[PDB]
Amino acid sequence: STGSATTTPIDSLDDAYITPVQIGTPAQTLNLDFDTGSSDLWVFSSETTASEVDGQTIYTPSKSTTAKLLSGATWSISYGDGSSSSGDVYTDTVSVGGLTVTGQAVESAKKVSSSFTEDSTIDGLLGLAFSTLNTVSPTQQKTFFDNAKASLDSPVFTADLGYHAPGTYNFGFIDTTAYTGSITYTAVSTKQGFWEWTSTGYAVGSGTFKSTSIDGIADTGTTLLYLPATVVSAYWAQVSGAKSSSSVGGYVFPCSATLPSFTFGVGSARIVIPGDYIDFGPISTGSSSCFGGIQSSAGIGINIFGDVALKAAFVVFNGATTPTLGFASK
């Protein structure tokens, strides 16, 4: 089997991407944030505290003839940005782009933190990291991909995120029309539950490539590119007037700037992030200070190849017995 679904930016800055997902019988379609950095499929629901729902579409398990309470199961997750959610668990039928999993754990939110409430466009998360990170207790549950994998034509999914435009998540096949040149594959460590890999270095603009190992995670659920402070400083030093602002919470730059590209290495191959991908717009409405898309990972504790990086590539999440990651230009 295979599946193919379009993923769409939630706003004009590509702050996140949503993908329609069918849950239950009859189908209830929710727009979920596909997140290769976590492993819970959770949704706003009829059980979510009313004051914490503000415009999201909810899953109502009582209206699904295939929903079953997973008795005694609870979940609770906290993400790197301090956001969180928790609740109980149903199993139900879940379909993405024509690919169907029966008995998928659908984690129903009883509580969500303020940033989730405040984002009316995201109805939940669909985790695509390794199932070892799943938070369901006392019986850990599998991700949608883990459940689908054996049925897929090939045990892979691909992320093809757009810049200020829709893109595609495919399951079970590699669309050879969706990228240019060849796909370069690179090793993955699953030890921390992430799609963790090591970039071979970077360049800023037309500058020379610096060969240096950068361990980090391929994370569609993080907006920006978070890298070591040394790398980030080298980038922003090429932008007149750019500075790290403690009050704003990262590097800002004059909105009048033309940003340089940023290149990262994948083995001997190179992925080029155009300068415009690194512009996240005014820090507040009407400001001439703009927020940068490349930020320091210092104090996160891990480097993160988030959407800013991934959207410059066609990315293969290869779930073979020994997982690997593939990157192609597009």
Side-chain angles (χ1 to χ4, degrees), residues 1-62 64-67 69-109 112-141 143-148 150-190 192-242 244-330:
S1 61
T2 64
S4 182
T6 298
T7 190
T8 302
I10 64 166
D11 63 23
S12 64
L13 298 176
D14 299 347
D15 280 317
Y17 297 77
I18 50 172
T19 308
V21 176
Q22 282 69 51
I23 309 176
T25 308
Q28 299 180 38
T29 299
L30 275 65
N31 296 328
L32 305 188
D33 183 353
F34 281 25
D35 180 5
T36 63
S38 69
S39 307
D40 286 50
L41 193 174
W42 73 259
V43 297
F44 279 78
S45 75
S46 57
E47 303 181 326
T48 311
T49 299
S51 60
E52 297 178 353
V53 183
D54 187 5
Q56 296 82 9
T57 296
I58 62 167
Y59 169 59
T60 303
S62 67
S64 173
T65 56
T66 41
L69 178 72
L70 186 62
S71 182
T74 59
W75 62 280
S76 180
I77 195 162
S78 303
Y79 300 98
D81 64 353
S83 65
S84 64
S85 53
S86 59
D88 54 18
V89 188
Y90 294 83
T91 57
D92 209 340
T93 302
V94 172
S95 299
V96 175
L99 172 63
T100 300
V101 169
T102 57
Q104 174 65 46
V106 176
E107 302 171 34
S108 169
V112 304
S113 65
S114 59
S115 61
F116 289 117
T117 299
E118 290 160 1
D119 188 354
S120 70
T121 71
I122 293 175
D123 301 326
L125 269 59
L126 190 151
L128 292 167
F130 295 89
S131 293
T132 53
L133 294 179
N134 176 266
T135 77
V136 177
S137 178
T139 307
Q140 189 171 61
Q141 301 293 305
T143 70
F144 176 80
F145 177 56
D146 201 348
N147 281 324
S151 299
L152 295 178
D153 291 357
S154 179
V156 306
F157 69 90
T158 66
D160 179 11
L161 304 179
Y163 167 68
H164 294 357
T168 306
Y169 282 103
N170 291 329
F171 292 82
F173 71 105
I174 287 158
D175 179 359
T176 61
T177 72
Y179 57 89
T180 60
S182 54
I183 305 176
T184 296
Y185 289 85
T186 196
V188 163
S189 171
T190 65
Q192 290 189 65
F194 303 118
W195 292 91
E196 186 173 359
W197 66 290
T198 302
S199 172
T200 49
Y202 70 98
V204 177
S206 59
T208 61
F209 187 84
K210 175 74 170 181
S211 293
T212 183
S213 295
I214 309 300
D215 297 337
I217 67 169
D219 186 4
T220 59
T222 290
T223 311
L224 306 185
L225 174 53
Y226 294 90
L227 291 174
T230 49
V231 179
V232 176
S233 181
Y235 178 79
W236 289 110
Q238 298 303 310
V239 180
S240 293
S244 183
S245 170
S246 58
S247 60
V248 176
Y251 282 88
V252 296
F253 67 94
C255 292
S256 61
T258 299
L259 297 176
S261 65
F262 184 90
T263 299
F264 64 93
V266 182
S268 52
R270 305 288 180 255
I271 299 295
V272 180
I273 306 171
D276 294 338
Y277 288 28
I278 297 159
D279 176 20
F280 280 74
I283 59 169
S284 293
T285 306
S287 180
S288 73
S289 185
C290 273
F291 198 70
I294 294 178
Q295 295 294 346
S296 179
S297 65
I300 294 173
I302 195 161
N303 299 308
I304 307 172
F305 294 87
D307 299 334
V308 164
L310 301 183
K311 75 178 81 168
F314 176 88
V315 188
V316 181
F317 294 79
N318 171 26
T321 304
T322 299
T324 65
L325 274 167
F327 294 80
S329 295
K330 65 187 183 190

